[PDB]
Amino acid sequence: GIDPFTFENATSDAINQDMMLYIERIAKIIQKLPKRVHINVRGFTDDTPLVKTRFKSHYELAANRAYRVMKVLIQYGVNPNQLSFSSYGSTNPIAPNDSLENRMKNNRVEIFFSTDANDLSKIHSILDNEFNP
Template identity: 40%
Template sequence: MAIKKKEEECPKAPAWLTSFGDLMSLLLTFFILLYSMSIISLEKFYQVLKGLIEAFGGKQVIFSEGGALKASRIPIQFENMHMRVKKFAELKKEITKIKEELLSMGIEADYLVTGTCMKLRVNTNRLYPLGSEEPYPQAKELFLNMCSRLKPFSLPITFEGYTDNMPISNPRFPSNWELSAMRAVSVLRLFITCGYPQELLSAVGYGEHHPIAPNDTPANRERNRRIEFCIKLNP
């Protein structure tokens, strides 16, 4: 006896409809995500804004309303905004002028920005007698002139002394460490003489370490004998 197949109650949906349904679900999820991202948490916005201003050197954020943000238009006072924002271009311009003047005198010089420090790199071959920490008289005048031009910025400065790898050993300087440190200190003392705030000045000696050229030729060793003015952009 032949068996009769049971008739299907409803026909199967076409295959494309399954893919279409998945696409609609994904689109719905996407628009829900966009909507959730468009809602700004004012509390978190306040924390991010405060962090950014302090990172740029601002001392504080003053709102007309206390606590967290309660409105989208609240004036913020930026009178204590950091030098890096207000005076960076002026400082760079002055450093560039100093560099060009040094080059015109035959003194190798350059500047670079590393992190929060703008460095003025000055070769010491024409500024110090070989093996001495006492600069030439004309070099003293040069350092004093640089001090008078950098003093209006009132930024912390670290003087970094460097030498080549030629060993030195005498009663005054047992190694290049002492010589490089004393050269840095000699510039620091000149800046104090011209009235630069002492609390903003420091000196360090690196000796023959951190060379900018291989110590394999007399010319390269001359390049490594230098003083670097690390002008800190974040007081």
């Protein structure tokens, strides 16, 4: 399956260089998709305390992450008309927050496609060509 954008720094919204390149690939994929497909960039966090940062809440942290990924997709030519962003904060974890390994799973941004039934095949086919050799 396709990978989400993982934030290794549990308390920041910083997009490093490896992640920028990956966002760029997804951007290239997105612009090839039919125009009636929209993209919702969703933001998540673990439950690491936020005390020594600027963020008041995990929602706020996840919003910044999703917004920033969205910003980057636009940088690489995705039309703002196909885009939106959402924050789920520390709700909806992939894994429980017991260990460092599982907490990384929770520090991510996920891409959601909004598509009809016919455009779903096209997305499927386009994603297959670019991601699986």
